Amino acid sequence: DKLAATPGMFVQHSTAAFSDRYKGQRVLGKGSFGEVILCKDKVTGQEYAVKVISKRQVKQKTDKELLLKEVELLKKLDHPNIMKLYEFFEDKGYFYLVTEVYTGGELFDEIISRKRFSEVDAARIIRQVLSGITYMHKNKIVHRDLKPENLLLENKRKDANIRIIDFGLSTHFESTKKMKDKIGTAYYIAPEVLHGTYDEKCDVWSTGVILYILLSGCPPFNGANEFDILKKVEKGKFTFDLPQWKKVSEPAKDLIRKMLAYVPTMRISARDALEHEWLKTTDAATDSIDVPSLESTILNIRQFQGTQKLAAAALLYMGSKLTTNEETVELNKIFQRMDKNGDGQLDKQELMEGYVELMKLKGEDVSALDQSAIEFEVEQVLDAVDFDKNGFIEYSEFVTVAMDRKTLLSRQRLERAFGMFDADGSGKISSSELATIFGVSEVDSETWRRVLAEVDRNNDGEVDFEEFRQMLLKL
């Protein structure tokens, strides 16, 4: 019964008041359902996006179930290009969703300002989208509502990273049963969804529509109104007949055509679309990538000794929940590069190749490497870093472990971390509090023993804020 530390186990765990952790700054949006508030974490000064929902806004029993469901999706997801959920709170009359703040606004608005995207630009953007959804599709989640309106740029830099959002029409899927609900948006929605039977491939279609727009500034299917769009769509025919397309390379068209294959069975999957030459070829050579960053990350990984569960959870919390995007930009690069097959996980092969790739850049000769020795080392790294024990290194796990410990173990982070564990505010962490954070009924006497003998200096049977400090700060 291996206690799996996952980013998501931290989410619903606090049941404090909004004001116990946050200070509002301004309103980011109001809707009939609720408002999004820009808040400042009182302790860390970091800036978060808090959606605040009145119980009265959503007391449709389906609706409570619907929201709770979007929450469980988000708790599960963890990918550099997909929205990150930090916390879910409850009030006497309110629910709170603490999300990361994405300061770049909608891809839509960036569309209506420059109109057309560079082939380089568009490939990079679309690459990210498909990686998001490859991940989602792998994990049996289909979005059903892709569009520039539901993609945000993280910040304002020229080639900023992209994040997928509003999982309110998203759902779980089992390959054996096809979905039926008619959900989506005029310009982007795939024929089969109109017909009432569809699969996750609709997300590919939508992405294909998105890509058409990026390259030409126009939808491939248009209409006087929604209805006229839908008819155009359902009939299925589109064309590269616009003058704009004269400039654009044939493979890009080829990808577009493979993504807008009318019948889902013949339409390319996300995984496979990722391998399209264009996405492949738009990278003319590896962009200049810091070897030092790469070397240090690989070094910070090797030296993560396997560890007792209290520290593991602590670190995963700090990595997954307390790190600013500015903070992890370079890392998420390396991760993505490491993750050839796009699915947002590192596996033994991908990790092993990473180290080898690094070696040659160090100029080391590849036929001169004790391959069976690397493998072993890699097997052990995975054992050490795989906090949820699924045999894969996920992005949160990666960031936790790849970040400079000194940087990550900032004092604010440390304080706050202890705070989350010590639910009774007693200043002392009980095994019961540990079990609670893990999401489990009780912790094995085994595991508690194996943690105290390494942290409990007073020997009072519990872990206080300084015992905590030393444990982690013990390099």
34-66 in b/e burial notation, b at 16+ Cβ within 10 A?
A: bebbbbebeebebebbbbbbeeebbeeeeeeee
For position 394 contacting Ca ion by CB under 5 A, the verdict is yes
Torsion sign over Cα 276, 278, 283, 285: positive
> Pick from 228, 272, 424, 466: which binds Ca ion (CB under 5 A)?
424
Polymer length in residues for the chain: 475
222 known member of a binding site:
no
Tell me how crowded residue 160 is: count the other CB atoms within 10 A of its CB. Answer: 18
For position 388 contacting Ca ion by CB under 5 A, the verdict is yes
> Pick from 21, 343, 399, 400: which binds Ca ion (CB under 5 A)?
343
Residue with smaller CB distance to Ca ion, 145 or 462: 462
Backbone φ and ψ of 35, nearest 5°: -125, 155
C-beta of 29: minimal distance to Ca ion in Å? 34
Alpha helices in 241-304, H assignment, sequence order: 250-259, 270-273, 277-282, 291-302
Longest Cα–Cα distance of the chain, Å, equals 77
DSSP state of 79: -
51 known member of a binding site:
yes
377 known member of a binding site:
no
- Asked about 241 being catalytic, the answer comes back as no
Stretch near Ca ion under the rule CB under 5 A, chosen from 194-202, 314-322, 424-432, 434-442: 424-432
> x/- site string to Ca ion, residues 433 to 462, per CB under 5 A?
-----------------------x-x-x-x
Contact criterion met (CB below 8 Å) for 392 and 338: no
426 known member of a binding site:
yes
C-beta of 386: minimal distance to Ca ion in Å? 4
For position 386 contacting Ca ion by CB under 5 A, the verdict is yes
Element at 306 (helix H, strand E): none
Residue with smaller CB distance to Ca ion, 7 or 220: 7
In terms of Cα–Cα distance, which of 50, 165, 49 is closest to 107? 165
How many Cα atoms are found within 13 Å in the side-chain-facing hemisphere of 99? 26
> Pick from 155, 296, 300, 341: which binds Ca ion (CB under 5 A)?
341
For position 145 contacting Ca ion by CB under 5 A, the verdict is no
82, two tokens: 């997909």
> Pick from 215, 339, 420, 468: which binds Ca ion (CB under 5 A)?
339
Q: Point out the catalytic residue in the list 145, 199, 203, 386.
A: 145
User: 């500015």: which residue's tokens?
Assistant: 326
> Pick from 256, 422, 451, 472: which binds Ca ion (CB under 5 A)?
422
Total residues at the site for Ca ion (CB under 5 A)?
18
For position 345 contacting Ca ion by CB under 5 A, the verdict is yes
91 known member of a binding site:
no
Contact criterion met (CB below 8 Å) for 429 and 443: no
Stretch near Ca ion under the rule CB under 5 A, chosen from 38-46, 303-311, 370-378, 415-423: 415-423
C-beta of 327: minimal distance to Ca ion in Å? 21
In terms of Cα–Cα distance, which of 10, 18, 99, 97 is closest to 420? 10
343 known member of a binding site:
yes
The type of residue at 360 is K
How many Cα atoms are found within 13 Å in the side-chain-facing hemisphere of 331? 26
Contacts of 249 (CB under 8 A, 6+ apart): 119, 278
For position 470 contacting Ca ion by CB under 5 A, the verdict is no
Q: Are strands 47-54 and 171-172 parallel, antiparallel or unpaired?
A: unpaired
For position 353 contacting Ca ion by CB under 5 A, the verdict is no
C-beta of 416: minimal distance to Ca ion in Å? 15
The type of residue at 280 is K
Stretch near Ca ion under the rule CB under 5 A, chosen from 30-38, 207-215, 258-266, 419-427: 419-427
Tell me the C-alpha distance between 222 and 416, whole Å.
Answer: 51
Residue with smaller CB distance to Ca ion, 340 or 405: 340
Residue with smaller CB distance to Ca ion, 200 or 422: 422
C-beta of 276: minimal distance to Ca ion in Å? 18
Binding-site residues for Mg(2+) sit at 150, 166
Binding site for Ca ion (CB under 5 A): 339, 341, 343, 345, 386, 388, 390, 392, 394, 422, 424, 426, 428, 456, 458, 460, 462, 467
Q: Any idea which residues carry the catalytic annotation?
A: 145
